[PDB]
Design a protein around this nucleic acid. Sequence first.
DNA 1: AGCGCTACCACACCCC
DNA 2: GGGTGTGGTAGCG
Length: 266
Amino acid sequence: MNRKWEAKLKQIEEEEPPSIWRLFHRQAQAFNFVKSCKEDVHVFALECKVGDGQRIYLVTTYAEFWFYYKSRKNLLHCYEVIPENAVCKLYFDLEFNKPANPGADGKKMVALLIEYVCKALQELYGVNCSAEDVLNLDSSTDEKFSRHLIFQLHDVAFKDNIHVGNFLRKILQPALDLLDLSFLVVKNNMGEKHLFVDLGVYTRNRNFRLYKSSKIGKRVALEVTEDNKFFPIQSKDVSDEYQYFLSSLVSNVRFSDTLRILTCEP
DNA sequence: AGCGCTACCACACCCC
DNA sequence: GGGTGTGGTAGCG
Ligand SMILES: Nc1ncnc2c1ncn2[C@H]1C[C@H](O)[C@@H](COP(=O)(O)OP(=O)(O)OP(=O)(O)O)O1
Ligand SMILES: [Ca+2]
């Protein structure tokens, strides 16, 4: 109830074919529309013209969004809005300052990370998976090894992203102590000891840069790594790039009549 | 007309 | 000197 109260105060304080394309200034007004929609619609965040994080919000289906998005001539700097309390996938934001840590073997650190989380998923939930179920994206530059991992688990999902964070803090506590998970620590922008895993992305209504999208500032967009081992099922009725787009979406959990929802309280 | 939060610091408090 | 909650903005994500 504590969350539903903060929104109520912010509110008072503030022919053609079957298409759906609604832009909203307030994230709250967007989700309100989704409820009164009657169509499998979702919420996207577009970075406004301002160089800061000022964002506007779009509401449309995945298919209709990919239609006006695939060319990459329009709708640049888009983000997925991960709805609070909604079932989602296991994902990661991986990033360290390249020059600050030279000896870091990026492609080797991710494999060690995945094999750990995989083992963790088995010991704690009986879930079995391998890197073959891990969509691997890249947005790196000459100064930042940036990677996004989206797990594609078979009939499995988390209660929400808040529980994903709890899962990681639990299994990454041995590394957090280091103010064998030695390969996680990395020197930050100013010599400080941060964690190769960004644990600040597991919040309510988190934005997450979409596939083939770059921040309003730079121009490097997310793309599938070369060592990626997740390959969707080829379907003649939709393009392959659309498959990766659907997979990459954190909050687009495969409909399954045997879905195991995973929880984890802190 | 973004949104969410925590890391950080100040203070106040308590205890033999 | 240690140890434990409480505000409250400032800045990351
Ligand atoms: N000002 C911001 N406002 C709202 N959401 C943000 C903001 N900054 C970051 N986020 C969200 C969207 C981002 O996809 C998510 C992770 O932070 P961030 O690392 O900066 O983006 P990114 O991982 O997609 O690119 P990269 O890390 O390589 O710079 O947090
Ligand atoms: Ca990042």
